[PDB]
């Protein structure tokens, strides 16, 4: 259980920042799509956004269907694949997790035992030293 690269598609990332930054100061949360592999390359494909009530320190997903009504709206094009993880944002505070994050993350892992969280910090994320 090591050496696990996490490749990311460049079409995925910059969508993570833009919606990950436009909501600043209040934080923001969406989803990841991809596919597990045997153990190592837990890649990522594409992302999107659940609606939400954002604060500077806290947020939830309001609606519980716009993520479900859209995958079923995507496979008509099938431009992506199933779900693999979820991200969120700490706008100026550093990159870590909190007791709320685990309680929701603790659902995904028992649901599916390699799912992943992602953290980003756009304010101090200058044209050089990203901190994702």
């Amino acid at each position: 259980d090591t050496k696990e690269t996490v490749y990311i598609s460049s079409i995925a990332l910059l969508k993570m920042l833009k919606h990950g930054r436009a909501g600043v100061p209040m934080e923001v949360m969406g989803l990841m799509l991809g596919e597990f592999v045997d153990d190592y390359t837990v890649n990522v494909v594409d992302v999107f956004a659940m609606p939400q009530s954002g604060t500077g320190v806290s947020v939830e997903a309001v609606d519980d269907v716009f993520q479900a009504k859209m995958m079923d709206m995507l496979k008509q094009t099938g431009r992506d694949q199933m779900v693999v993880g979820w991200y969120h944002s700490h706008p100026g505070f550093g990159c870590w997790l909190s007791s709320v994050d685990v309680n929701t993350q603790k659902s995904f892992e028992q649901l599916n035992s390699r799912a992943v969280a992602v953290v980003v910090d756009p304010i101090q994320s200058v044209k050089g030293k990203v901190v994702i």
């Binding site: 609606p51 939400q52 009530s53 309001v62």
Partner: protein, 37 residues
Amino acid sequence: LDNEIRIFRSELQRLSHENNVMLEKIKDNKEKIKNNR
């Protein structure tokens, strides 16, 4: 005036579809404000 009701019921069937539609997009926003309130 038999053709009246064979016709002027059709429009009634339409505006009900027009009403329930517009009835929902406002319900949509009506909840958004509470999420951001």
